[PDB]
Design a protein around this ligand. Structure first.
Ligand SMILES: *[C@@H]1O[C@H](CO)[C@@H](O[C@@H]2O[C@H](CO)[C@@H](O)[C@H](O)[C@H]2NC(C)=O)[C@H](O)[C@H]1NC(C)=O
Ligand SMILES: *[C@@H]1O[C@H](CO)[C@@H](O[C@@H]2O[C@H](CO)[C@@H](O)[C@H](O)[C@H]2NC(C)=O)[C@H](O)[C@H]1NC(C)=O
Lengths: 50, 49
């Protein structure tokens, strides 16, 4: 029944009949992007001091 | 359905079955669509939670 974006609604239908499920990761990709941006800004502005 | 058993939610679908084909199948040998023997309509099968 279509696929809205990647994980917009998805009907929570990662299930496939005979007991086989896929679990979502703890950290969404936005948090990882924020982590990388923080590390990169820190290394540009402060060097290795931070 | 005509000797084909299972369990799940039946819903209306928009598949295009050939005139002689009876039931569809996924890429993992699982059924996903069935012809209704009395009235020729395509029913999709989705497992309940
Ligand atoms: C759980 O199922 C219900 C079904 O009632 C979903 O409700 C849908 O909500 C969206 C957003 O408002 C509507 O556009 C749909 O029309 C609703 N469904 C129906 C059948 O009316 C609900 O979104 C589902 N929850 C999740 C997390 O997928
Ligand atoms: C098998 O199912 C019924 C058995 O009577 C028939 O199909 C319906 O028949 C009624 C009246 O007998 C009609 O009003 C409906 O319009 C029919 N439905 C369809 C989908 O044609 C008929 O004998 C057989 N139907 C089919 C499709 O083979």
């Amino acid at each position: 029944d279509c696929l809205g974006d990647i994980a917009a609604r998805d009907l929570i239908c990662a299930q496939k009949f005979n007991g086989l499920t896929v679990l979502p990761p703890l950290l969404t990709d936005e948090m990882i992007a924020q982590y990388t941006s923080a590390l990169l800004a820190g290394t540009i502005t402060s060097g290795w001091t931070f | 359905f005509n000797g084909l058993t299972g369990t799940g939610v039946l819903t209306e679908s928009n598949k295009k079955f050939l005139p002689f084909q009876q039931f569809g199948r996924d890429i993992d040998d699982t059924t996903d669509a069935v012809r209704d023997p009395q009235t020729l309509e395509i029913l999709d099968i989705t497992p309940c939670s």
